[PDB]
Amino acid sequence: SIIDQNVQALFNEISADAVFVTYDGQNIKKYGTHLDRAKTAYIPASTFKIANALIGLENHKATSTEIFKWDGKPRFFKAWDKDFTLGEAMQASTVPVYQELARRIGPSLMQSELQRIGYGNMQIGTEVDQFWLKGPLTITPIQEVKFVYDLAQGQLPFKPEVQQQVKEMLYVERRGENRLYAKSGWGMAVDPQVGWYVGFVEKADGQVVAFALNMQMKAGDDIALRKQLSLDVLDKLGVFHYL
Numbered sequence: 001s002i003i004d005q006n007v008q009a010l011f012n013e014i015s016a017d018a019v020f021v022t023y024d025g026q027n028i029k030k031y032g033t034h035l036d037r038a039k040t041a042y043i044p045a046s047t048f049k050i051a052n053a054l055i056g057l058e059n060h061k062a063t064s065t066e067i068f069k070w071d072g073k074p075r076f077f078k079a080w081d082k083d084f085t086l087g088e089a090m091q092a093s094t095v096p097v098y099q100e101l102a103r104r105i106g107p108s109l110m111q112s113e114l115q116r117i118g119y120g121n122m123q124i125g126t127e128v129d130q131f132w133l134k135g136p137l138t139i140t141p142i143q144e145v146k147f148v149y150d151l152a153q154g155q156l157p158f159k160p161e162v163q164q165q166v167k168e169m170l171y172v173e174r175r176g177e178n179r180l181y182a183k184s185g186w187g188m189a190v191d192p193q194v195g196w197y198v199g200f201v202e203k204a205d206g207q208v209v210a211f212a213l214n215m216q217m218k219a220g221d222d223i224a225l226r227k228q229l230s231l232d233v234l235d236k237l238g239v240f241h242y243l
């Protein structure tokens with residue numbers, strides 16, 4: 001309709017190849033400049049933290065209260081040179097913390113868990129703390145959006161309390177009773193570079209609309225555009241109106 005047109009007109013100023021997928025538990029909808037991106041597999045990059053935390057908590061490798069202490073070695077972002085809980089590292093997207101969690105899980109368990117939940121192509125290669133950053137693990141935007149939709153509903157094959165704890169690690173903001181949850185990603189090690197913004201809007205009436213922005217990134221791109229574009233789309237859709 002006109003909302004589709006308003007949504008499309010947003011992407012018609014973005015030069016990068018982009019797709020935006022929505023899922024309400026019944027219907028996949030696709031918007032953007034390159035719709036075949038929705039069916040194409042990319043590395044999850046930092047959106048893998050969602051499955052990493054779930055796997056770690058489910059298998060008693062971490063708790064949501066435990067402090068991952070900094071080891072004194074200066075990290076890429078200086079905002080990372082500190083101690084973190086998993087939720088704190090999620091919202092700061094502190095890769096070293098989630099690499100430490102992956103090493104605690106181990107390649108054997110990480111592999112069987114990824115096969116057990118059917119996450120992307122379920123490939124980890126031989127480096128348990130790099131597979132979501134450099135490959136070989138890949139996932140399509142439709143897989144991502146169906147993944148976080150099930151998270152929102154607590155219907156993933158994990159303990160209910162584990163799903164709840166990881167879910168609230170993703171909480172961004174609320175407007176009225178509508179809640180936004182989201183995780184961004186920028187995979188820089190692979191060619192082309194892939195940018196993510198995945199999440200879901202939950203309304204008070206139990207209803208969930210999950211979403212996945214997926215677009216090509218290049219060095220020098222605006223770090224805030226992924227979230228900005230996504231919030232604009234959700235506003236034109238009337239899923240998450242601006243205040």
Ligand SMILES: *C(=O)[C@H]([C@@H](C)O)[C@@]1(C)CC(S[C@@H]2CN[C@H](C(=O)N(C)C)C2)=C(C(=O)O)N1
Nearest residue numbers: 045046047093094095184185186187220223
């Ligand atoms: C996650 O996908 C990604 C990597 C490190 O796992 C992460 C956490 C980094 C970024 S932004 C990135 C850091 N500084 C870059 C830059 O522009 N330069 C040149 C310094 C951009 C993100 C993100 O999603 O924004 N995720």
